[PDB]
């Protein structure tokens, strides 16, 4: 069947896969290539000293456990497959209360290339801290940060 071969490929990839271990654990550093597409820069709240931002947050990394040979080079899979594999535990250092949208479904996509390159993007609404100096108010200007990184994994 058309889909049974891809089912076999996915079963083979997940056979013996331990998502608790990062790629290259104990032998190399996991290099995560990241980018952000800001779909809308939310309003700034002076009272709370914060701001909102809606982003497509894209990450990508190499996982040699997930390389495959198949009819197509890229498997554009359901977001359910993301939970079955290791993904970075990225978090926002100055985030206050963020939302990972799941309407109608989890707004995530995972794509596995034949060479083992994974692309993984999420839709997020981040409410981040933007401390301000209001001595020049209302003629003031600010530089609101957005800082992110791994929560558990060091350099």
């Amino acid at each position: 069947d058309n889909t049974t071969v891809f089912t076999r490929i996915l079963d083979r990839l997940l056979d013996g896969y331990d998502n608790r271990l990062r790629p290259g654990l104990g032998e190399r550093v996991t290099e995560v290539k990241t980018d952000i597409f800001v779909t809308s820069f939310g309003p700034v709240s002076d009272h709370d000293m914060e701001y909102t931002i809606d982003v497509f947050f894209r990450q990508s990394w190499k996982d040699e456990r997930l390389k495959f040979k198949g009819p197509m080079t890229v498997l554009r899979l359901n977001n359910l497959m993301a939970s079955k594999i290791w993904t970075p535990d990225t978090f926002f250092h100055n985030g206050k209360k963020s939302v990972a949208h799941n309407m109608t479904m989890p707004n995530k996509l995972l794509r596995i290339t034949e060479d083992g390159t994974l692309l993984y993007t999420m839709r997020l609404t981040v409410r981040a801290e933007c401390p301000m100096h209001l001595e020049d108010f209302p003629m003031d200007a600010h530089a609101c940060p957005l800082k992110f990184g791994s929560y558990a994994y060091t350099r």
Partner: nanobody
Amino acid sequence: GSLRVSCAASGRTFTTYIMAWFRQAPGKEREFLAAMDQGRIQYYGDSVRGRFTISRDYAKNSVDLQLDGLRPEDTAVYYCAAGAGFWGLRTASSYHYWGQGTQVTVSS
């Protein structure tokens, strides 16, 4: 050769500001060495990454820079600065408060 250049602020609490170290050699323009943010996050220039280490004492309102692996081209006037990082964290124009500068020289 090793060194430690300290900077102490007075007249204003810089807890919520970025504190940075810059360098100016004779003839060359002012360049960014290091910066540290209220979130204890450290930014370094490419020329001095892994050698110079920036730190902040928030209780004393001070920023320190440990210098290791000095070379002859590190001879310059080193400036302490404080700012809000508007358009910056690397441009000198973003820092409103500046120290007088301290000479440093390396002899082979």
